[PDB]
Structure formats: structure tokens, C-alpha cells
Write a protein that binds this ligand. Structure first.
Ligand SMILES: Cc1c(CN2CCC(Nc3ncnc4sc(CC(F)(F)F)cc34)CC2)ccc2c1cc(C#N)n2C[C@@H]1CNC(=O)CO1
Length: 468
């Protein structure tokens, strides 16, 4: 349109007015992605990018939003000539989807920082011709909606986005980049990534959005950061209000990371009358088990982060052990570096800091430590084992660093008499290792004295010692 009914709430004068606009669109046949993203982007522009407004909330006048909306839709409609792409009866062709992706891609500024903040929305695309990676995929979907292509939907993994189209969403197409300067796979399917068991494509258990999940995505995509020290509290509150609206309407049911995002917000600002963060984290894991075969990593990472912030050492290590149990059924590929870096920091920064604080109290003489709990030691081992198994599914190993020095250190935080209580059982607390690297370490892990050189040899597959 804009249709008449889409315009009656303007001007938007408050974050509550924005929520009413999302509620109205979520009540329609198909919520208007372009309208909603433009509004979120406009508000974020004046609360996070250029804070020049003279009122608390940057009043959103219909004349401004309508002009931006008409600019987008006319750009897309003028550049994508549907007459050239006969549609098979509610089915978009791969050429048509590629054409929409090319129109978005070719409109982007030739040079900018692609990981800058606040370039996620259609407001940034229209005013700045800049988008970040997943913002390109979202803009393709909004453009397809504007063109009447009801079968084109956003597909989301835990670190990438693309589109699905055709009957039941059976065709996939890459429409944006991943990482930096990698392949130009635009227009290809994701079948190779699915078949290779790379985490980036979730073995095919990725999210296939309907339009209301596409609204949930843009709300998660809100970035309240003003700088590295300061968030906009008004943006955070808007994002939290919008996530509760989607929650109430049932649209986070199949969106684990949105439930974790909402829990993280509730931790900073508990909404009176709403469930606790811990309930939300477990709902996210429950969603991942129900809809995605328990193939997602972040539901457990959200939970581990919570337990870590609250110093529940046992429960953090349990959640990290669960994260590794998910990752072990993937095969490491270079495109998976983002989750690799997260595991690397957990192993080499987060866990050492937690166990160091535990060790200091225990050294003073205080009993009942997590360091005295063989279930805790077993979770630490399962965490390493899953990461090793993941790596073993790759082609070329050589994953240096972090791993050996802090593995040895973390092992030594537990006394021999605790480590010795874990039973490591082969198939065909109790632990079964899946990785060949940890299977070979079993007797080194329960020695009274941790043999640092032998453990490093085994973890690095180094076969030789210093000549002298
Ligand atoms: C909680 C959390 C976050 C937050 N993060 C979670 C994923 C969210 N993503 C998305 N959210 C919603 N929709 C989509 S859709 C999509 C794909 C698309 F973008 F392509 F679209 C992505 C995406 C973005 C916010 C980061 C690192 C975390 C944790 C917890 C832990 C631990 N334990 N860690 C590891 C760190 C390592 N180093 C440390 O110091 C401390 O722990």
C-alpha cells in the first residue's frame, strides 16, 4: 500500500504506540515486513545513531514513513519485472528470487564496514544503501513480500541467513554473504552445507520462517547499543515489549534464540508479572528439542551464560557439556569459525576464570566446592570431548592454541581423588568418550599427578618430544 488501515496509528509518539502497530500488523493476513522494519529502523536511528530529537521518543510521522516505504516499493517494483518471470501458481522461480537478491545486492554502497551496528533494517537500506549480511537476506524477503511472492521466506541458522521458496519451502537459495571474502554462492542451494554436517546449516534443522517469525527476527535484530558502554534504555524496552507481544501470540514457539534474547533482557530489567529468565532459557531448549531435533548450540549457551553470570559453576559446566554434546554430531568446517571462537573463549577464558575463583575458596579450606564434585569434572571432560569429536569430522586438523595449556590447567583444578571417581566407560558419574583424542587420554585424566607433557602430546597429536 500503504493500506488505509496501516496508517491510522500515526504519528507514533511512544514505544507503546510502536507495540500497537506491531500488534495490528501481527493481526493481519500477512504483517507488512517493510513497514515494520522501516519503523524500527527510524526509531533506532534517532535513539542509537543520531540522538538529535527534542522529545523522549522520536515521533514517527506518517508522511516520512510513507515516503520511505514508497521509495523502497517503487525501487523494487521498477527493477524486478515480474512479467519476465512467469509464476507457476504460487511458486516463485529460482531466477525470480535471484533477480530480487541481485537488485538488493547491486543497490548497496560499493564500500562500507559490513559488521557496523545499525545497518540491519530497511531504513538503513533505503537511506544509507548499507546492510549487514543477514540484513540483505531480510531485505530480499521484504522485497519479495512487496512483490506479492507469498512463498518466499527467511531461513535462519545460528550464524547465517538465506531464503526458501516453492512448495512447502522446498527450494533454498543463498542471497547474502557469510564470513568475509569467501565464496559467491548466491543463487545456490544449501544442500552441500546440509550434506556435509556443517554447523552453519544445522544438518537441515534450521529455522524456516513464516511471516510472523520474520517479524520476530527483525525484533531480535534491534540493536540498542549507543556505544560500547551505553545502550538506549528506550530501545531495550521496546525490544522487550515486542518480544513479549510475539511470545503471547505464539510466534516465538519455534524460535529458540528469541526466547534466549528475551530471557537476557528480563535479566537486566525484569518485567513485573512475567516468567523468570531461567524459565525462558529452558523454553528455548525445549523449542530446540521439539522443532529442531536438539541440533542447536545457542539454547544451551544462553543457559550456560546465565549460570556463569550467577556463579552456578556446576550448572554452567552442565550446560557447556550439553553444548558440546550437540556440536559433536557436526563436522567442523571453516565456515563454522564463529562457534569455534565461542568454544575457544569458553575453554580458554570463561571456564578458567570460574574455576580459578572456585579454587581460591577451596584452598582457604571451604568444603562443598564444585571442584570436589566428580559430576563437574565429568562435564568438563564431556565439553572437551564433544569439541574434539567435531574437529575429527573435518579434513585437516591443526587447531592450535588455547586448548592444551588451559585444558591442563583446568584438569589440575580438580584433585586426584575427585577425578578418579569418574568412570569412563567404552561403548561397546559415568562418561563415554566419542572422540579419539579423549579416548586416548582416559588414564592420563585420572592420574594423581596430571602429566602435562603427555596430555599435550595426545591433544595435539604430536608424536615426538624435545631432542634435548
Ligand atoms: C548468549 C550469548 C551470545 C549472544 N548472542 C547469541 C546468538 C544471537 N543470534 C541470533 N539471535 C536471534 N536470531 C538470530 S538469527 C541468526 C543468524 C543470522 F544472523 F544470520 F541471521 C542469529 C540470531 C546473538 C546474541 C553470544 C555468545 C555467547 C552467549 C552465551 C555464551 C556462553 N557461554 N556465549 C559464548 C561467549 C564466548 N566468550 C565469552 O566471553 C562469553 O561467552
Amino acid at each position: 500500500g500503504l493500506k488505509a488501515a496501516q496508517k491510522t496509528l500515526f504519528p507514533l509518539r511512544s514505544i507503546d504506540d510502536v507495540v500497537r502497530l506491531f500488534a495490528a500488523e501481527l493481526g493481519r493476513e500477512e504483517p507488512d515486513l517493510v513497514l515494520l522494519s522501516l519503523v524500527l529502523g527510524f526509531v533506532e536511528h534517532f535513539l542509537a545513531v543520531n540522538r538529535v530529537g527534542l522529545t523522549y521518543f522520536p515521533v514517527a510521522d506518517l508522511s516520512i514513513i510513507a515516503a520511505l516505504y514508497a521509495r523502497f516499493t517503487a525501487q523494487i517494483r521498477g527493477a524486478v519485472d515480474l512479467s519476465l518471470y512467469p509464476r507457476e501458481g504460487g511458486v516463485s522461480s529460482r531466477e525470480l528470487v535471484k533477480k530480487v537478491s541481485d537488485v538488493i545486492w547491486n543497490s548497496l554502497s560499493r564500500s562500507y564496514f559490513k559488521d557496523r551496528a545499525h545497518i540491519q533494517s530497511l531504513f538503513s537500506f533505503i537511506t544509507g544503501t548499507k546492510l549487514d549480511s543477514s540484513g540483505v537476506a531480510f531485505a530480499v524477503v521484504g522485497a519479495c513480500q512487496a512483490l506479492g511472492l507469498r512463498d518466499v521466506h527467511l531461513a535462519l541458522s545460528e550464524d547465517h541467513a538465506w531464503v526458501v521458496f516453492g512448495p512447502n519451502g522446498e527450494q533454498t537459495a543463498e542471497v547474502t554473504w557469510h564470513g568475509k571474502g569467501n565464496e559467491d554462492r548466491r543463487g545456490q542451494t544449501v544442500n552441500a552445507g546440509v550434506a556435509e554436517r556443517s554447523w552453519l546449516y544445522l544438518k537441515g534443522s534450521y529455522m524456516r520462517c513464516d511471516r510472523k517469525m520474520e517479524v520476530a527476527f527483525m525484533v531480535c535484530a534491534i540493536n540498542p547499543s549507543i556505544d560500547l558502554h551505553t545502550d538506549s534504555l528506550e530501545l531495550l524496552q521496546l525490544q522487550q515489549k515486542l518480544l513479549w507481544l510475539l511470545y503471547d501470540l505464539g510466534h516465538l514457539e519455534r524460535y529458540p534464540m528469541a526466547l534466549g534474547n528475551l530471557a537476557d533482557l528480563e535479566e537486566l530489567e525484569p518485567t513485573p508479572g512475567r516468567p523468570d529468565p531461567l524459565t525462558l532459557y529452558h523454553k528455548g531448549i525445549a523449542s530446540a528439542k521439539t522443532y529442531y531435533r536438539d541440533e542447536h548450540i545457542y539454547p544451551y549457551m544462553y543457559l550456560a551464560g546465565y549460570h556463569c553470570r550467577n556463579r552456578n559453576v556446576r550448572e554452567a559446566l552442565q550446560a557447556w557439556a550439553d553444548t558440546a554434546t550437540v556440536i559433536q554430531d557436526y563436522n567442523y568446517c571453516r565456515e563454522d569459525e564463529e562457534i569455534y571462537k565461542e568454544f575457544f573463549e569458553v575453554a580458554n577464558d570463561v571456564i578458567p576464570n570460574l574455576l580459578k575463583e572456585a579454587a581460591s575458596l577451596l584452598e582457604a579450606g571451604s568444603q562443598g566446592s564444585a571442584l570436589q564434585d566428580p559430576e563437574c569434572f565429568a562435564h568438563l571432560l564431556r565439553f572437551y570431548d564433544g569439541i574434539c569429536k567435531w574437529e575429527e569430522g573435518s579434513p585437516t586438523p591443526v587447531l592450535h592454541v588455547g586448548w592444551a595449556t588451559f585444558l591442563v590447567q583446568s584438569l589440575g583444578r580438580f584433585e586426584g581423588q575427585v577425578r578418579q571417581k569418574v568412570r569412563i566407560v567404552s561403548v561397546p558419574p559415568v562418561l563415554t568418550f566419542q572422540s579419539e583424542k579423549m579416548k586416548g587420554m582416559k588414564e592420563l585424566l585420572v592420574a594423581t599427578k596430571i602429566n602435562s607433557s603427555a596430555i599435550k602430546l595426545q591433544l595435539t597429536a604430536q608424536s615426538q618430544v624435545q631432542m634435548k
